Design a protein around this ligand. Structure first.
Ligand SMILES: Nc1ncnc2c1ncn2[C@@H]1O[C@H](COP(=O)(O)OP(=O)(O)O)[C@@H](O)[C@H]1O
Ligand SMILES: Nc1ncnc2c1ncn2[C@@H]1O[C@H](COP(=O)(O)OP(=O)(O)O)[C@@H](O)[C@H]1O
Ligand SMILES: Nc1ncnc2c1ncn2[C@@H]1O[C@H](COP(=O)(O)OP(=O)(O)O)[C@@H](O)[C@H]1O
Ligand SMILES: Nc1ncnc2c1ncn2[C@@H]1O[C@H](COP(=O)(O)OP(=O)(O)O)[C@@H](O)[C@H]1O
Ligand SMILES: Nc1ncnc2c1ncn2[C@@H]1O[C@H](COP(=O)(O)OP(=O)(O)O)[C@@H](O)[C@H]1O
Ligand SMILES: [Mg+2]
Ligand SMILES: [Mg+2]
Ligand SMILES: [Mg+2]
Ligand SMILES: [Mg+2]
Ligand SMILES: [Mg+2]
Lengths: 372, 372, 372, 372, 372
């Protein structure tokens, strides 16, 4: 009878809210900030850890740590702080009266999911829980039942093909190139113009620059020729303390690492070749249905040139007699949460929750038999 | 007073409909498809088994099984599913208000016919039923009363000679080389050009290639020399996912196994030698009447070179003073069903049905004494 | 002074040895096996043709051909191979130093005997050669001078009556129904239980099943009722590759074609009616002497129910005041060879040999004037 | 008079040497490594491509490509580099003074063999060459003349039955599941414990882990329960840079794809069912001789549990009255080369070489008429 | 034919000389001194700018400015004065008859290199020039071909790993903590004992104190406990105008900022953690070769405790099964110049010079293409 909770815990953003809602109520950066300087004035309330937007608003005196790196949780006390801020401070609800739905990247370690279930059932003890694949939730929010999903966020870019509600786990392909790698590459290439960013507070500034000013070029070499010829692609950004920086080709050299990973020295292929290899790893008779239903999700797929570039690259890779369609909804930044809210509100989902007595009888192993 | 049903249950196609009609209403492939992958999307209607054209339209996530192999039913639950789909889903009628006429290849096991009678009288309990030889139905649909019928379908190629309505059971010859063996030989020889088809879904693609592009050469060695000299016999086929394949001699090397079974390592002779030996096993005074009435039936005899090749081979085998005629009607793919509809509509057939009280008094043994 | 050779060349077994011996030294199947597959290993000595027991021991890669069909030699190069294997490989003697006695079925073509004489005198050139009727040799081996002989082997079942050493050629009957026809009928009726045998190697397996497990029922309808009531007549046979088959009425439905030829669609009467009609075709005053001396010979008369069945059928056909005796010795499988060894060792036989100068002066026509 | 060369060009290892030798002199991995980073130091000799063990010793800065994928050569310049390294750098001989024997997988494209002949006669122009089936060479090195060979290497697992030097091409089965697929599955399942291997250099590390630590379980469910109960099957491996990884059930979950291909989403059956279906596709009278001569060859059959598991599975599949023997010699990793050295040293093989004038007269089509 | 010039223009020292020499002839501090007082007496030569050792010898009446700050040239007229003093006053040669090799820190602005090329080709116009990375020259002077170089000078501390002559640009790390920052930290912490230094002339005195008296402690806490317990680590320095100062823990608190940057409020990690992260950012198979070839260069590595401390910290960070070696040659203060002299004397380098016609055709953009 109670309302379930949907909490997408991504590598860079935590999106939590109630099932049945259209948009998540709490979208906050998953960071933990700790003071790196000395406190000299007594009386003022100084906490040992700042979580969420409070870490963002005070980041000039804080070291910021991400509890999740490449979809894998590394710090568990910081992850508990993120979950406590999500439940008690943002959603303002008691977790013991609400089932919680959580998301997880494919090809993740088992101990991550086991410790997630242990924390959900022993520290924030819920009546029930479930762990779902993010690309299945993206396909749920897309409204269709078939297609291949490229979900790229802050740590993980994964392609999962699903045909008529049936997933193909041998064709699920995961690449560890996402928005944090693009932010680091933008930091590396911003030193060519004389702008130096080294701190974790400056990481958020470079990430804001990447969110506001970067775009995907349709043709890379033509865009470098255009940038070298005239200064028409140069854009200006205002730093928080007063300086104005100007960037040229670095607007489109940063997300080009999504298509050319050798910019950061990785042997893997681009996201278009990842999608094509995931499609050709499937059975033949479904491949056409995977060609016309390329579903994009995640914030990293929110550059305003990525759909046409993906369409062009897959059309160059696929045979010319096949129709290529890239599904890029405007709400695809939060589509994992929207699909989780759709899934948790279904009447055919209520018997597939992992309840507390099943956890007590099974221990940290039920989540590998009731979830994928 | 009620209309009888005619259901030709072949090894690769089920053709069911009403007696007195010219064409069968329901022609669907006799396959049962089961999901070989995992289901990840709840709420979507996913059945445990897909039967008929639904298995064909979703074959990329299904393992397809044929319930009938070489004219013998191996899986009986799958055959019950086939009959349930044929009666309730395709013909949309209740089987308890309609007598059902079924077909059977000659020299079949007795347990197949006994279990067919048991399922038709205890699961789909009919007022009456009859089991008929398919070649007699092909002769009924041909409109003549004498001739030797070569019926070749998906599992069984059988020659049955009938003179003036009298069948000769000692000259009935059965060969287990038909369209599925030709399809498997086509998947074997398609690897010479670099095309790999190993799944059961790809077997349907190879079967479609064989149906659309294969033909019987009039002279095999001359066609081999023509295909080796110039690329004029090469044809292109578009795969369901986009690739275009090209085949040369494999258009006529595939049905040449009908005339040279040693292509698949079988000691038996070709269909022309089978027909000639079946004619030579009969009485001499009827042999001329069997020479001018060679009736072709079944889908495997639907290649556009098989009538002239059979005429040439039998004319080479028979003495030159006798007239050889191959009767190949354009409707011979469904001629067993057409002859079943002709036989079931006859007024002289209504007393030869096996009714329910006769089955109750005799048990599963009446069909060996009321049918041949 | 030299020892003569006796070589019974039957349709399914060649039995060769020396005159004066009690049992033939070389009893081997008259088959020629040729490889139907491709040879991939070099150095391993692979012959083009395998003859005799070597063809039986390697029959899984060989097509086996019988040079003699229904008592008539159809392949003469294969018959040369059979005779060469009989002389040089089995008997290990030079044919030019030994006269050879051969057997032949009655009512045979004259060209068969003429070509036999030509091959014996120009390829395996003997000092002398004689051709004898097999039933006269069976009467020689029986030790009596009167009686009617039913000799049934692999191709020919013939009845020959002889009274006091005088044969009656107008009462000699020949029927082309023997052990190979029974093997083909068992091959046909084994498909009712789901066992499929189609190759020439499997024909030898069915022949072994017929030799080991088949028997002649005393009353056919009573045995049908007994087999239909209880499964007490069912016997199990172990196949060469591991399967165990079980047969019921087919143990006695197979040799019942000897008494009911209409099982294989032949208008001729059974062996008992052939024997009775051969007896009543003779003179009346000898008929009683033919009633008490029914001599059985050949392997086809080796079923363990045939003597009592023949006695019952002839006693039903003959008048009740005549004594009917069926002479079935245990050595009747080789009795033609035993009578040939008896005849060739006689001192009154040495001037009825056809020598080489008589063949040189007369050509291939002496065998019609010195032999019957 | 000159010594012939035997060069087994497998999908993952090239084994080249002289005819008449017991072990191949040059066993090197068939990879071509190219630098993926930039070169900053001049004077140091930096080649554009590293072939063989030099690519293995410098793989941390190289992208490694296999010229042969699933037994089919995809890159021909890289295969020319492989052959040049095999002839000039490893064997240290001139190919124009030595005939060369090559091996090839069954059911391969014809263009692969034609181009193999073309490069062997026009770039490394030999006096003569021959292309042989690898399973025939494995049976040659086994010392026997009959048996069914399961040869599983890096790309191709094929079953070929040969009886008395006669192969059965209709029973030859090819499956595209071998050691590279097992290596990719081990990279897939190594992410469950937190170990990430995505580069081509790390694929060699995972292949070394699979070679050193993996084994075939006799019972899969019992071994899974044993691994889940206690940590007695866990083994530790030292990475090349210092970390120690520990694996549990993944020691036997990796080669279980050989018996359960559905672990990588493939519809085909396991190697034991493939062997049983290849035996049952043969003639019956040879099947017992195929039951006791199961010959294992290739490196993929080098797990220390595969012979007992294959024996158990085939004994469960075969009837209990047949003796099942799995022939697994300790030298079966190089047995294709050993059989090639045996075949090339035979005196009966010297006339079956394809010489240079025959190739000049016939063009690149003689290899389909002088080889199988 | 003419001798090339090697000019390492560091942030605090300019080292210029001829190619092929072992030691640089001109090592002078890169400062420009300007008079801050009033000249009251006339006649003798008082220059407006004093460059080099003349600025050091008269620093009591001069304000000293560094033209290079953190590896980036800020004052270009002062840099032209530095280059003019290096060419015409120290080396006493004409720059128009000698090619010049220049060094540059990694991750530097492009405009610095472009203006360097413009000044060297338009003000001190050379026949040819080249810009090289300092760490590649340090690896050249070390004599080895692999290893990771930590080059720490006056403005830039950078780690560059090179494996077999191939650099990895994604693992190159730059930290703006070097000898000038340590000098400023010593200027800050010298006020605790009552010694006040505020002027630019006193900064050279504090730099001399840091060069003569400072050392790296092996254990920091034990050394602070030893300094707090007894005054055994206290050392005395004589000021240029007479006073004697004594320092205690400040001998090892100053270079500890190299390992603990939080002493000057910097969020970055120490040089040992930077080296370990640069090794861990590389591929796995080269990391062991980077563990045993840690190459130190620059004057900031001239403390007589830094090699053992770096060995201890990396051995604590790396796994214990790896060998850690810190290569610290005694000539590593000038090793960038030594490697430049080695590189400029190579015969394989003479075609990679950027000549004057290429500069005239390309303008200020060729140096980003012919150099890294
Ligand atoms: N407008 C935008 N353009 C480009 N990148 C964006 C934009 N908005 C967000 N991102 C990137 O998306 C990443 C997070 O996306 P999302 O998948 O929604 O969160 P998470 O990865 O935490 O699940 C961030 O690293 C951010 O850099
Ligand atoms: N036009 C065609 N050309 C060649 N083969 C065909 C054609 N149409 C059908 N077939 C083959 O005929 C087989 C089935 O024939 P049919 O006798 O009608 O069905 P069934 O064998 O199930 O009774 C199929 O395997 C199919 O491959
Ligand atoms: N024990 C037996 N029972 C039944 N039939 C047998 C037996 N032994 C042999 N036969 C049959 O006898 C035939 C051959 O008999 P025989 O006359 O001795 O040889 P041939 O006919 O070659 O002269 C064979 O076809 C075989 O099937
Ligand atoms: N001891 C071993 N255990 C398991 N697998 C092995 C072993 N040795 C080799 N292999 C596998 O065998 C494959 C190659 O086997 P082989 O047939 O000798 O070479 P190729 O396939 O190139 O002809 C390699 O992929 C390797 O992973
Ligand atoms: N013996 C020494 N002990 C400590 N530091 C030194 C020593 N010698 C030089 N340095 C420091 O090294 C720095 C310059 O080193 P170097 O790299 O040779 O010059 P540059 O940085 O100008 O290229 C100076 O700032 C100086 O403080
Ligand atoms: Mg996400
Ligand atoms: Mg049919
Ligand atoms: Mg006989
Ligand atoms: Mg191999
Ligand atoms: Mg320096």
């Amino acid at each position: 009878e109670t309302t379930a909770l949907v909490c997408d815990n991504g590598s860079g953003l935590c999106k939590a809210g109630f099932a049945g809602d259209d948009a998540p109520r709490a979208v906050f950066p998953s960071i933990v900030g700790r003071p790196r300087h000395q406190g000299v004035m007594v009386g003022m309330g100084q906490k040992d850890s700042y979580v969420g937007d409070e870490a963002q608003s005070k980041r000039g005196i804080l070291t910021l740590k991400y509890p999740i790196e490449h979809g894998i949780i590394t710090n568990w006390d910081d992850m508990e702080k993120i979950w406590h801020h999500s439940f008690y401070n943002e959603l303002r609800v008691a977790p013991e009266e609400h089932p919680t739905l959580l998301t997880e990247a494919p090809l993740n370690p088992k101990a991550n999911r086991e410790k997630m279930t242990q924390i959900m059932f022993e520290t924030f003890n819920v009546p029930a829980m479930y762990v779902a694949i993010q690309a299945v939730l993206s396909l749920y929010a897309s409204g269709r039942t078939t297609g291949i999903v490229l979900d790229s966020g802050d740590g993980v870019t994964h392609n999962v093909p699903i045909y008529e509600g049936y997933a193909l786990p041998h064709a699920i392909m995961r690449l560890d190139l996402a928005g944090r790698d693009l932010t680091d590459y933008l930091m590396k290439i911003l030193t060519e113009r004389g702008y130096s960013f080294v701190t974790t507070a400056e990481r958020e500034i470079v990430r804001d620059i990447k969110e506001k000013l970067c775009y995907v070029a349709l043709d890379f070499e033509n865009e470098m020729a255009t940038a070298a010829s005239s200064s028409s692609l140069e854009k200006s950004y205002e730093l928080p303390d007063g300086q104005v920086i100007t960037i040229g080709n670095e607007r489109f050299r940063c997300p080009e690492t999504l298509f050319q990973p050798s910019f950061i020295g990785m042997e893997s292929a681009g996201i278009h070749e990842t999608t094509y290899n995931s499609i050709m790893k499937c059975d033949i008779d479904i491949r056409k249905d995977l060609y016309a239903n390329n579903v994009l999700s995640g914030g990293t797929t929110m550059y305003p040139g990525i759909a046409d570039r993906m369409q062009k690259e897959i059309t160059a890779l696929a045979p010319s007699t096949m129709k290529i369609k890239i599904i890029a909804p405007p709400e695809r930044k939060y589509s994992v949460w929207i699909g989780g809210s759709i899934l948790a509100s279904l009447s055919t989902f209520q018997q597939m929750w992992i309840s507390k007595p099943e956890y007590d009888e099974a221990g940290p192993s039920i989540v590998h038999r009731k979830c994928f």
